[PDB]
Amino acid sequence: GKITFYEDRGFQGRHYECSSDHSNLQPYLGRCNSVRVDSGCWMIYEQPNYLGPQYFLRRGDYPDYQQWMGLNDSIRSCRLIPHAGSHRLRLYEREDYRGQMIEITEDCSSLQDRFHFNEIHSLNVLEGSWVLYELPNYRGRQYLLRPGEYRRYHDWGAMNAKVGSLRRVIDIY
Amino acid sequence: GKITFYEDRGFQGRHYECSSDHSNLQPYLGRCNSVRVDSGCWMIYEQPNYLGPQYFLRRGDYPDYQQWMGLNDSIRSCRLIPHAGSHRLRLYEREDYRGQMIEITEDCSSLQDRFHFNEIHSLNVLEGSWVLYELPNYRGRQYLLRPGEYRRYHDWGAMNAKVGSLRRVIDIY
Numbered sequence: 001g002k003i004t005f006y007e008d009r010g011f012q013g014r015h016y017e018c019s020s021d022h023s024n025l026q027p028y029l030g031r032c033n034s035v036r037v038d039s040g041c042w043m044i045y046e047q048p049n050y051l052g053p054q055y056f057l058r059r060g061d062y063p064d065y066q067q068w069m070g071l072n073d074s075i076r077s078c079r080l081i082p083h084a085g086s087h088r089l090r091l092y093e094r095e096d097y098r099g100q101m102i103e104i105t106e107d108c109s110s111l112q113d114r115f116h117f118n119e120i121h122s123l124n125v126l127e128g129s130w131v132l133y134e135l136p137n138y139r140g141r142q143y144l145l146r147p148g149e150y151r152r153y154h155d156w157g158a159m160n161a162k163v164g165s166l167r168r169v170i171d172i173y
Numbered sequence: 174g175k176i177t178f179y180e181d182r183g184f185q186g187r188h189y190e191c192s193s194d195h196s197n198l199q200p201y202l203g204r205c206n207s208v209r210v211d212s213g214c215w216m217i218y219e220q221p222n223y224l225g226p227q228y229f230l231r232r233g234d235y236p237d238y239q240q241w242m243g244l245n246d247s248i249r250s251c252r253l254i255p256h257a258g259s260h261r262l263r264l265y266e267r268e269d270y271r272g273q274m275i276e277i278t279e280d281c282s283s284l285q286d287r288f289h290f291n292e293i294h295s296l297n298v299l300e301g302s303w304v305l306y307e308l309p310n311y312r313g314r315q316y317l318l319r320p321g322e323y324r325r326y327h328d329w330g331a332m333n334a335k336v337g338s339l340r341r342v343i344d345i346y
Contacts, residue, residue, distance in 0.1 A: 101187065102200045115200070 001040020032075035084128025119161035135164040169173035174213020205248035260301035290333035308337035
């Protein structure tokens with residue numbers, strides 16, 4: 001993949017280009033006000049070492065931080081999210097894989113409407129990466145879910161078990 | 174009505190309880206090798222949206238799929254068959270309601286024996302729901318017939334016009 005970060009709005013200023021995961025953009029970029037995603041699906045984070053709020057971005061032009069639904073111009077690390085041919089995920093009602101389990105292979109814009117669930121307490125990401133949204137219709141705080149187990153909501157980095165929508169991470173060509 | 178599906182034989186593993194129609198059980202059940210029907214008469218289908226092979230089940234326990242004469246352990250949808258206090262059906266010799274017409278208001282273990290027919294090309298279900306079996310004594314492939322007309326066999330989901338027995342969807346509770 002290939003992503004280019006710019007210090008100022010509208011693709012101006014000092015810029016930095018990445019073709020891979022970057023744990024601390026700080027020495028090469030003072031702030032991030034626009035981004036051009038040439039290829040790949042990327043998750044960008046507010047602090048180094050993949051901490052803080054995260055935002056999913058796919059191929060396209062982002063002339064301002066609001067275009068990626070960003071909160072501010074602090075972007076300090078990023079991950080290139082590998083493409084997956086298939087997506088499969090199990091959501092559990094209680095911590096540690098307990099209570100009712102629901103398995104999904106497609107995007108879900110509303111968990112409450114589709115399955116009458118408003119919170120997920122544990123999950124197992126079997127295949128592909130997904131982005132978990134706190135609010136329906138893919139809004140709210142975003143959390144990247146990569147293949148693997150998450151026994152509690154803290155493990156995917158949320159502050160609570162609230163989930164509103166889920167989307168698989170797929171390439172836009 | 175109330176039915177409980179289990180992923181494993183003998184009522185073990187992940188289960189899911191239903192009390193109404195479900196066009197897609199895939200998220201709640203990865204397979205089905207046992208069913209416990211507490212009430213109602215139900216049709217279960219191999220595919221979502223009531224497609225593929227169909228099987229009729231009434232109150233009672235089914236410890237394995239052979240119990241409901243299933244072909245395998247894939248159950249993707251199910252529907253509660255509303256009861257009726259009366260049944261009436263007209264079978265036709267030929268497609269589109271032509272040829273001899275036989276009207277029955279009771280179960281028929283053998284079509285060939287009783288009416289000397291081996292195939293039915295069209296039907297008109299006037300009252301109640303019936304289950305048509307490809308073979309005598311109520312075995313073979315099953316097809317739920319709800320009130321309504323069927324110009325041809327494809328209409329009730331069969332692969333050919335062969336009919337062996339017919340049974341009225343009657344309740345034990």
